[PDB]
Amino acid sequence: SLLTETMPFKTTIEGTVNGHCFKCIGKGEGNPFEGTQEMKIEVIEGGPLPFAFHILSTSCSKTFIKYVSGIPDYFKQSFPEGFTWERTTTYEDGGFLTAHQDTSLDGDCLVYKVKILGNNFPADGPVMQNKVGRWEPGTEIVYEVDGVLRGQSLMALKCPGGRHLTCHLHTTYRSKKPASALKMPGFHFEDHRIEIMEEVEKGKCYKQYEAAVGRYCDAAPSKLGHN
């Protein structure tokens, strides 16, 4: 493939959350086929962020997923044309985090352009108070709809006091390559384990890691030969 064992990627992020404008830049690399990656995000405008960086964790990279059981790779198949994704994450305490992202292959490096609009986060909530813990790993269900791919997941942000702030992700993935030229994957799961490796600079620079896997429900046996 046009993807190397160690693919580098750059990102530019622009957004407004609860009326606060900000801008980020980031760089990282990962193993596309092993489904691992890491990057450093830098807030170049509006820093230090007045909210937990974590609500941006999923907006910083679907090319880095390890697909097992022969599941087709919608993202890797999309190159060199690339793809885009759109999503609205709804938090159980009222917040909404909407994002649109464009993924392209510029030479030997992947390029992400991200637009973000977040709102309604409670001023007294863990996010705006910036008192969150970490993301538990999340499992997304991905299936074909309208010729494109749809995904949904429930994620849980561990917060101090033994609390879990959950949210619901509603995603749509669009290949820039015609559906006719793609091998659409069937209904499957996509585990995403996100971990902030280091807070290089409070509210201004973070190092984030993610391991992802595309699989079927291997734990529970089927009696009718279903995936």
Residues that bind its own copies (CB under 8 A): 16, 18-19, 35-36, 84, 86-88, 90, 92-94, 96, 98-100, 115-117, 119-120, 122-124, 134, 136-137, 139, 141, 143-147, 150, 152-154, 156, 158, 162-164, 166, 168, 170-172, 174, 187, 189, 191-193, 195, 197, 209, 211-213, 215, 217, 219-224, 226
SS3 label, residue 139: strand
CB of 105 to its own copies, least distance (A): 18
CB of 108 to its own copies, least distance (A): 26
CB of 216 to its own copies, least distance (A): 8
**Which residues lie across from 149 on neighbouring strands?**
144, 173
CB of 207 to its own copies, least distance (A): 11
DSSP 1-45: ----SSEEEEEEEEEEETTEEEEEEEEEEEETTTTEEEEEEEEEE
Is 35 or 126 the residue whose CB approaches its own copies more closely?
35
